[PDB]
Amino acid sequence: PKSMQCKVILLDGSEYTCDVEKRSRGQVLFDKVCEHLNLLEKDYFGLTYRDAENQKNWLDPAKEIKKQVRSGAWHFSFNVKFYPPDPAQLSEDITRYYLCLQLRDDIVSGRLPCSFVTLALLGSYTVQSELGDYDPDECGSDYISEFRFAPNHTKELEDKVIELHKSHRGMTPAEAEMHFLENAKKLSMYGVDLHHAKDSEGVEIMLGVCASGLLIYRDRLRINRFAWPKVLKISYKRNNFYIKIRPGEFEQFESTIGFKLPNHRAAKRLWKVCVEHHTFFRLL
Numbered sequence: 285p286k287s288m289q290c291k292v293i294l295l296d297g298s299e300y301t302c303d304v305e306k307r308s309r310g311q312v313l314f315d316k317v318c319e320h321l322n323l324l325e326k327d328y329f330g331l332t333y334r335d336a337e338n339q340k341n342w343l344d345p346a347k348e349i350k351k352q353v354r355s356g357a358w359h360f361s362f363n364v365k366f367y368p369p370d371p372a373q374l375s376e377d378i379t380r381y382y383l384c385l386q387l388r389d390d391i392v393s394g395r396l397p398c399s400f401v402t403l404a405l406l407g408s409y410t411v412q413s414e415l416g417d418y419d420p421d422e423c424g425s426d427y428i429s430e431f432r433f434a435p436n437h438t439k440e441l442e443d444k445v446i447e448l449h450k451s452h453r454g455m456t457p458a459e460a461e462m463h464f465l466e467n468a469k470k471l472s473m474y475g476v477d478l479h480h481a482k483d484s485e486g487v488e489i490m491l492g493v494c495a496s497g498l499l500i501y502r503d504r505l506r507i508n509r510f511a512w513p514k515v516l517k518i519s520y521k522r523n524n525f526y527i528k529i530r531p532g533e534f535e536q537f538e539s540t541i542g543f544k545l546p547n548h549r550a551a552k553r554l555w556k557v558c559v560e561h562h563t564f565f566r567l568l
C-alpha cells in the first residue's frame with residue numbers, strides 16, 4: 285500500500301511530516317495534523333496548498349489529495365478557515381491559542397491592518413502569554429523583542445509593547461490570549477478573505493468573504509455588504525462570479541449581481557469559499 289510523504293507548515297512556523305496512502309482524501313491528513321496539535325475544535329481550521337498558478341487553495345477534506353495538488357508537491361499549511369466572530373464561545377483554550385497564532389501571522393503579513401495602539405496591545409498580550417510577567421532585567425531602554433508584532437517594526441512600537449506588558453502582571457496565558465482575541469475580533473478586516481475582482485462596469489474592486497457576508501470594497505468611501513441570509517444562490521461561469529439576492533419586501537424579482545475575476549480558477553475558488561462561509565455561518 286503506497287504512501288506519500290506530506291509536509292505541513294504549522295502556525296508556530298515549524299514543519300510536521302507524515303505519510304498517507306497516495307489515494308487518501310484530505311480529511312485523512314487533516315485528522316493526523318489535528319491529532320498532532322491536540323486540537324478537538326477542528327471545524328474552524330483546514331489545510332491550504334499552492335496550485336500551479338501559486339494561488340492558495342483550501343484542501344477539500346472530501347476529495348483525494350492527489351486530485352487537488354495534481355502536479356505539485358504534497359506541501360501544505362495549517363490555517364484558520366472560519367474566523368469565529370466571538371472567540372470567547374470556543375470551548376477550549378488550545379483552540380483560542382491556534383487562532384491567536386493565525387492572527388499574529390495575519391498582522392505581521394499585513395493581511396490584517398491594525399493601528400499603532402492595537403499592534404502594541406496585541407503584542408503586549410502575546411508577550412504576557414509567552415514570557416509571563418514583565419521583568420526589567422531582560423528589557424533595558426534599548427530592548428527589541430524577538431517577537432514579530434507588525435509588518436514594519438519601530439523602536440516606538442517596541443517601547444509601547446513594554447509599557448502595556450507592565451500593566452498585565454498576574455495575567456495567565458489563557459487570560460492574555462482571550463484579551464488578544466477580544467481586541468483582534470473588532471478589527472475591520474478580522475477574518476476577511478480578500479479577492480481581487482472587477483464589477484459589471486470593469487471597475488477594480490476587492491470582494492471580502494467573512495462571517496457577516498460578502499463585502500465589496502471600492503475607493504474606500506463606498507463599501508457594500510451582502511449578509512449571508514440575503515444570498516439565495518452563489519454561482520460562477522467562465523471568469524464571472526454571481527450572487528442571487530432575495531427580493532426585498534414588496535419587490536417582484538430577485539436580483540443577480542455579477543463580477544469579473546482574473547481567470548476561471550479564481551472565479552471557482554471565490555465561489556467555493558463563499559458557499560462554505562454561507563453554510564458554516566448559517567449553522568454556527
Ligand SMILES: CN[C@H](C)c1sc(C)nc1C
Pocket residue numbers: 326327328559560561563564567568
Ligand atoms: C461540519 N459542519 C461545519 C459547520 C462545517 S460547514 C463547512 C463548509 N465546513 C465545516 C467544517
